Design a protein around this ligand. Sequence first.
Ligand code: HEM
Ligand code: HEM
Lengths: 201, 201
Amino acid sequence: MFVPSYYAAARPEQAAELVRSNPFALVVSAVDGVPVATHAPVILEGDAVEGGTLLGHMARANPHWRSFASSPDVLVVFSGPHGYVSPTVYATDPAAPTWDYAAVHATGRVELAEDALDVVERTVAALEAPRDPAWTPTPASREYFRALLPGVVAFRVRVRTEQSMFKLSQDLDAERYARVREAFAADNPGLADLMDRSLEH
Amino acid sequence: MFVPSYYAAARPEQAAELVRSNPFALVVSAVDGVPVATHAPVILEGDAVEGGTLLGHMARANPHWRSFASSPDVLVVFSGPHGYVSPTVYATDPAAPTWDYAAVHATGRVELAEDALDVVERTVAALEAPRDPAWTPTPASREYFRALLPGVVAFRVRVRTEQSMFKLSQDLDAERYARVREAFAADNPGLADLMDRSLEH
Ligand code: HEM
Ligand code: HEM
């Protein structure tokens, strides 16, 4: 990921907020020399991505985690709202398209987590908290979680470096920016909201 | 990525259809043995992902492509609709959550593409074709593309292997399945559509 200065986060908390809002992540490691990726729910422990700790899990039957034993470096990609920007939206005569998006990339050493129960229970808590209503695991469901643990592998990543991209057209002039934000208002409310938040100072 | 039998693609054209429908991809390779990823528009040349060729571009100022000159293996991830499955929807008591999603992972050897102009023009054509009205570059815009060319690097991936995941709850019995599909119908119609297509024969 390369992040041009004008697409950097306006405030550092924006990276953590993107991570928390988009927990279904891509966990990537270099099995041999080839990249291999698993889609998995990953949560953040700590106030900031940099220096924070990521917690995730996958199927034990997914052999990806077996490469994690050597504690190699992994990349976790969190992707927020995104959308194609067609030059039709600009209404200007020389133009080229782009794609607007926001993403956080976290890199660090992965470690298998012995407390797989705690990881999945924390993941439930995080993902359900903003739903209306939030699902509260019953005692029966918590005993179920315990019974399921042989089939799951949890892992932790201590974040050594992170980058965040907020590519949200903030380099356009006022009229063209207004057209882009307006065009995303109906079809892509999530992207328009991120657009609004990127200009809040 | 590991693909349980229940979540394998039903028909082989479904992988290529996902790729063509979701061109904003994640291009992943090793840089000093650690994974690095760039978000970029990537198009498919060919009827099938496996054995097909992917074409994409990225900023020249993005250093990711400098690791391609050795022609290492890359992974390109195409992501379709996805959504969290809360146990609230199952309406059963011992339960656990999951996440439903569809994705295609293409692996092969990457090479830098000299005709960067042709790559970006084919990308314009591909992404503007499903839109109405479609944006067709004027001669002025084509001249502008030529002016932009120093800042762009194009690349090709000859796809050696491909995996597709269609994790769409098809393992569920009918009453639990109907509740999952009904709950996505309002909030995530693209995902509901993908579940419908997963049951076709
Ligand atoms: C909190 C929200 C959760 C989400 C979004 C979620 C999602 C997922 C996903 C996407 C996979 C596939 C991973 C892969 O491809 O390797 C998976 C696997 C698995 N998860 Fe979770 N999970 C959640 C909570 C839990 C909990 C609380 C448990 C309790 C032990 C659990 C147990 C398992 C097991 C046993 C597997 C492997 C077998 C299977 O795929 O069902 N998960 N989960
Ligand atoms: C057709 C749809 C297109 C889309 C969705 C698109 C999207 C993008 C994206 C996401 C990037 C950032 C890559 C990175 O982070 O390294 C990029 C870079 C770039 N693209 Fe494209 N592009 C398109 C067409 C074109 C065309 C026709 C040209 C004409 C030469 C062009 C020239 C460039 C240049 C110069 C850069 C680097 C500077 C910049 O980020 O604006 N692109 N494009």
